[PDB]
Amino acid sequence: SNAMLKREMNIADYDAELWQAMEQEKVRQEEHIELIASENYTSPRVMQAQGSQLTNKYAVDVVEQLAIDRAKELFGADYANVQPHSGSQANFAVYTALLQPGDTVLGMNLAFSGKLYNIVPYGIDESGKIDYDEMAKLAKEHKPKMIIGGFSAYSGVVDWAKMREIADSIGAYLFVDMAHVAGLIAAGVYPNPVPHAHVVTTTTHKTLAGPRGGLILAKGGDEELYKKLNSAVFGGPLMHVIAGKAVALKEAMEPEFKVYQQQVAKNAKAMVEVFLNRGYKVVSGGTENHLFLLDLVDKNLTGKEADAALGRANITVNKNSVPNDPKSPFVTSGIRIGSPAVTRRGFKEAEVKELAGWMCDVLDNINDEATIERVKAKVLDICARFPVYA
Amino acid sequence: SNAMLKREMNIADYDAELWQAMEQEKVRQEEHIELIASENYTSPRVMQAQGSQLTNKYDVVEQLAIDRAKELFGADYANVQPHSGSQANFAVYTALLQPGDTVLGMNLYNIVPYGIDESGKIDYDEMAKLAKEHKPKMIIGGFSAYSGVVDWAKMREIADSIGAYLFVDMAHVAGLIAAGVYPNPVPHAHVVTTTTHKTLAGPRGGLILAKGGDEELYKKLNSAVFPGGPLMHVIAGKAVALKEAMEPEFKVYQQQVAKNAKAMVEVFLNRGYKVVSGGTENHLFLLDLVDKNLTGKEADAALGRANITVNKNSVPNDPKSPFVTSGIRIGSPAVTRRGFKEAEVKELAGWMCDVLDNINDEATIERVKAKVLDICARFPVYA
């Protein structure tokens, strides 16, 4: 025999370098305030699934059917495919199922798929709000085969019903990638694109708080579409990750998850209030979801500057361009902030308001070491009061 | 306190439905003999990494994987980010090819296939004919049911003669390559890819490796991987799996893999079965059942009744559909992992011949099943 004994076979016994790195990553997740809008803390049940012997399975079916059934129940889809390894892979399945090389696609942005297809962008104005009349004119002008909804840095709510009308008016597909807001949709606090788009994709981590992976959903499609989508996905699925998806999707149906998402939305609003009250500009002047963009043009700061300074105080954000950004995309004039992770670890309005205030202290004094050190200390204290896995 | 994040309530407590399905799979892995050539049993250290908080990360960990991949394979470039072998391959294509380019491969882009004969041996002269006539931008080496050695040096000569890239997908033999007991493509290819879970016995995932290129090439390969983020928990799994593969015991393992495959081959041949190519030089082989009036699908099902798992596979010039086939593909990595040596695999191969000789003899099926279960019980995978 040659049994692999779990008590004798662990990382700390065998691979000290890896173990030290893993320990330091747990410490980082605990003692940093994570405001990257795509970040979250998955449950220990998701982690248990991902650590399981399902990694050995070549593809089982019951585990997969639970994920599929739960995806359909949660989002009200008549079709779900839980196999994609990532949101990007889900998206690529959709493109290859429905598009030909060199087709025109209308996407949205701030004012490889780009290499294979002709992507025309609808750019949100300095107003920071979608203008559906203008979107309809771009659609009419360019006659895309597909309009793609979903954008990583929009703080407004997208009217998917209206987008479907625009798509239909020119015979295009509406594809919505809801990766950036899926958890809010799952909770009923943001509108669902499943009844309006021809196909929908998402990641399962981010606001859904599950494992990293993809999902394709649809409602009202024909057998033929569903068949094409299935065939475009692959090269088998990660069954341990699919188990992760199954348990995450059930967690998403808990009343606690609805309360959590309501808190996510309140928290993002409370942070916006502070930034505005401290003299910072927020794109659109508000948020209606979990995230927002701080426009630093009037401060003569770059997003890269802001991000580095905040990082020195154990606050993680990402840079992001603003509408008609006067700076290059490598630099930007904005940062994007979201509440899911801090909310997940127990921060409510008081904490996020205090945090926003500290961020304003940093940005007001971006090369003052003492401010940075003071704020770092406060961040560490707040992190201790609100531990993650406890 | 965060009710959803505290460790109190595990999957069994929370989601009995899911837990039951997970634990059935666990018991299935113990109670069946697995001869699907792409399957293995990864270590508990790999699973521990996959179960870690690294799933929440949006880099010392990645460097460890990169360094260990380069060391194991003798490469001066590695990318450990791909989610799968397929994504690794896709990265290479999108890095080096333009849409509609011509490509040559074994069994978006104009593909010219090269087809090994009934002899079950690669015809380098036919490969050369196709390459030199059609002038592909890239020749792709590596194929899933091939039991022979491949002359990677010769493929590079062919590629070099027409100015083409040589890409080798070594997924189907990577662990043997790593242990030095199968020809190494890394010195000869422009770029190589692999999965991390079959003969490497690691997590499911992809890898890109290369040597002898400049940073410009390596930058292109990096840029091509995500056309989002890596799975850092899986990458930690890769790091520890790659370290395990550097142990002298891993080479011993692969030597036993190769020896066991040859041993099973000898039984099939001696029992009147035909083996594509007449033998093996690696961990797998293909039985050609045409002369038995058997389909691969039916052979797969018959063996499954006795708790022996194989997969159907087309043979050269298969008279049957690809969904039916006239062959089965058998590999030794998983049985060897759980401790089978030559004596055990020889006995196993005899039982398989007993079933296939008389698929409808339920007495034989039941006899073999009981022996299979006894054998599985004394070779537990995990404890």
Short mmCIF file of C-alpha atoms in Angstrom, two decimals, chain A residues 5 43 52 72 76 103 132 145 155 162 169 175 210 268 270 274 299 307 322 337 373 378:
data_model
loop_
_atom_site.label_atom_id
_atom_site.label_comp_id
_atom_site.label_asym_id
_atom_site.label_seq_id
_atom_site.Cartn_x
_atom_site.Cartn_y
_atom_site.Cartn_z
CA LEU A 5 -2.10 10.18 5.36
CA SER A 43 -17.21 31.12 3.46
CA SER A 52 -12.01 18.31 -1.18
CA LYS A 72 -31.55 28.66 -11.85
CA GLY A 76 -34.81 32.76 -12.24
CA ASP A 103 -18.76 41.34 -36.28
CA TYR A 132 -30.49 55.64 -23.26
CA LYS A 145 -24.74 42.14 -33.93
CA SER A 155 -22.28 53.32 -9.96
CA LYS A 162 -34.57 49.31 -22.10
CA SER A 169 -34.94 47.57 -32.57
CA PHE A 175 -25.61 39.94 -23.74
CA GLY A 210 -18.37 32.39 -3.80
CA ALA A 268 -21.32 52.40 -0.25
CA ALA A 270 -22.48 56.25 3.48
CA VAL A 274 -18.33 61.42 3.51
CA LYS A 299 -7.31 67.74 -6.72
CA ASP A 307 -3.72 54.13 -4.65
CA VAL A 322 -12.86 58.87 -15.08
CA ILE A 337 -13.95 51.95 -4.17
CA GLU A 373 1.26 56.42 9.90
CA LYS A 378 -6.38 53.33 13.05
#
